Amino acid sequence: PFSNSHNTLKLRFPAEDEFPDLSGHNNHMAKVLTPELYAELRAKSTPSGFTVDDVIQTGVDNPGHPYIMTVGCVAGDEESYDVFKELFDPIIEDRHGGYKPTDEHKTDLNPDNLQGGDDLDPNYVLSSRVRTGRSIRGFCLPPHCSRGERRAIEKLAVEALSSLDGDLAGRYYALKSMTEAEQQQLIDDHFLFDKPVSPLLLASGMARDWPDARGIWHNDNKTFLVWINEEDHLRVISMQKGGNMKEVFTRFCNGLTQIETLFKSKNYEFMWNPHLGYILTCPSNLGTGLRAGVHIKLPHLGKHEKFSEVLKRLRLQKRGVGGVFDVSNADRLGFSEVELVQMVVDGVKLLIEMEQRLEQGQAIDDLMPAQK
């Protein structure tokens, strides 16, 4: 009797006895979950059996970081976001700068709407990349998917990828049958992924059956990479050496649309809706689930008192020093793919202009931008 006979058991206990102790937690979920909201949601379940305890588990197990906030919850299927919207909506509002339950998201994967980006100064921009994720409708997300679902996804993904030609022809590598020699090459290229080490991922149950049905695919030119069944059904990355962000984004769009077209011919669709855009496992990657970035050398303003305020105004974020930073868009939901990449292209050349002032010895006052 395939039945959530336990959720019914848990219901034999008063809500307060099952309520998690979140006293020292620093994540979006703990900030929103009240004993009242919990009692209201603990009886619900999505069509696939996903519950509120499943949504919040990773947030209960991981207190988080004293200064860095993490989301603390995951979706297990497309319906999760609707069935538990009373928990997800306020979290989405806080995590995505006021994005409200009534706002709409616009998708735009037309590379011709991107203004410049084909000439970022290579003397400062070492590399460029664009990555995103996708979920196939009808299948549960990684925290919840069964072995059958995972394998169906891999078969579907592999036959579509094997159909790509020309600039996008490549090969697939199943994790379980990968050789040491192949693994070495993948590591040297920075294309490899292994069983997650992050307890945030582990605590959600997404690592079950490792490495069954997990795989890596990339084209012969090594400019297009796809991960299958790791954190999301699909993770797609487009990159190359240099500052030609436009070519990277065009390949990204071209590769995405072809894969989507092949899936549609077989009657499969990516999880998507007008309000949250593309649906993925972690609420922080909703909308476009896109991260467009560059490895840029900014030794001078990297030490400036204003760098922090400039990034904020341009809507960029950093991470990685030796003067080399990883700069990418900070937004995910509420802007289209084109707009996000556009903000990285315009924001980067301004960033370069400010670095060239400091090289000379001139101040960077007249170059400060207005909050975008």
DSSP strands (E only) in 87-156? 125-134
Tokens found for residue 78 = 């497309």
Tell me how far apart the terminal alpha carbons of the chain are, to the nearest angstrom: 55
Residue (of 101, 15, 13) closest to 52 by Cα position? 15
Give the residue from 343, 338, 250, 243 showing the smallest Cα distance to 295.
243
Method used experimentally: X-ray
Residue type present at position 291:
R
Phi first, then psi: give them for residue 319, nearest 5 degrees.
170, 175
Write out the binding residues for ATP: 127-131, 190, 235, 291, 319-320, 326
302-333 burial: b if 16+ Cβ within 10 Å, else e: beeeebeebbebbbbebeeeeeebbbbbbbbb
CB-CB neighbours of 64 under 10 Å: 19
Pairing of strands 125-134, 170-174: unpaired
| Distance from C-alpha of 134 to C-alpha of 154, rounded to nearest angstrom | 13
Residues 6+ apart with CB under 8 A from 26: 63, 64, 65, 66, 69, 70
Residue ranges matching CATH 1.10.135.10 in the chain: 5-101
With the CA atoms of 146, 147, 153 and 159 taken in that order, what torsion angle do they form, in degrees rounded to the nearest 10? -170
| CATH 3.30.590.10 domain range(s) in the chain | 104-371
Rg (CA), the chain: 22
Residues annotated within a binding site: 127-131, 190, 235, 291, 319-320, 326
Give helix 52-61 / helix 85-95 axis angle, nearest 10°: 40
- Given a contact cutoff of 8 angstroms between Cβ atoms, the answer to whether 59 and 15 are in contact is no
Cα–Cα–Cα angle for 338, 342, 343, rounded to 5 degrees: 125
Nearby residues of 259 by Cβ (< 8 Å), 6 or more positions away: 160, 161, 164, 236
DSSP of 192-257, one letter per residue?
Answer: ---S---HHHHTTTTTTTTTTT-EEEEETTS-EEEEESSSSSEEEEEEEESS-HHHHHHHHHHHHH
Residue 172: Cβ-neighbour burial (10 angstroms; 0-12, 13-18, 19+): middle
Task: Please give the CATH number for the structural domain made up of 104-371.
Answer: 3.30.590.10
Give 93-99's long-range contacts (Cβ < 8 A, gap of 24+): 94/28, 94/31, 94/32, 95/28, 95/71, 95/283, 95/284, 96/286, 96/287, 96/331, 96/332, 96/333, 96/334, 97/331, 97/334, 99/333, 99/334
Q: Are 298 and 355 in contact (CB under 8 A)?
A: yes
352 touches 117 (CB < 8 A): no
> Other CB atoms closer than 10 Å to residue 65's CB: what's the count?
10
Distance between CA 189 and CA 232 in Å, rounded? 22
Q: How is residue 192 written in tokens?
A: 């490899």
d(CA 282, CA 87): 14
- Note whether 323 and 355 are within 8 A (CB): no
Q: Which of 248, 269, 272 is nearest to 259 (CA)?
A: 269
Strand partners, 295: 127, 326
Find, among 96, 21, 118, the residue nearest to 342 by Cα: 118
DSSP, res 83:
H
* Distance of alpha carbon 132 from alpha carbon 300, whole angstroms: 31
> DSSP letter string over 256-307?
HHHHHHHHHHTT--B-EETTTEE--SSGGG-BT--EEEEEEE-TTTTS-SSH
Can you read off the two tokens belonging to residue 55? 């949504």
CA 87 – CA 349 distance, rounded (Å): 40
Q: CB of 127 within 8 A of CB of 265?
A: no
**Resolution reached, in Å?**
2.3
Question: Beta partners for 293?
Answer: 129, 328
3-state DSSP: the chain helix, strand, coil percent, rounded to 5? 40, 15, 45
Which class is domain 5-101? mainly alpha
